[PDB]
Amino acid sequence: TCEICAYAACTGC
């Protein structure tokens, strides 16, 4: 999912 931190959910990024 967070392959390139694609989604807003992908925090830290």
Taken in order 9, 10, 12, 13, the sign of the CA dihedral is negative
Taken in order 2, 8, 10, 4, the sign of the CA dihedral is positive
Give CA–CA dist 8/2, Å, rounded.
9
Give CA–CA dist 6/11, Å, rounded.
10
* 2 contact partners, CB below 8 Å, separation of at least 6: 9, 10, 13
Assess contact for 1 and 7: CB atoms under 8 A: yes
* Integer-rounded Cα radius of gyration of the chain: 6
Rounded to a whole number of angstroms, the distance between the first and last alpha carbons of the chain is 13
Assess contact for 5 and 13: CB atoms under 8 A: yes
> Which method, experimentally, gave rise to this model?
NMR
Q: What is the 8-class DSSP label of residue 4? A: T
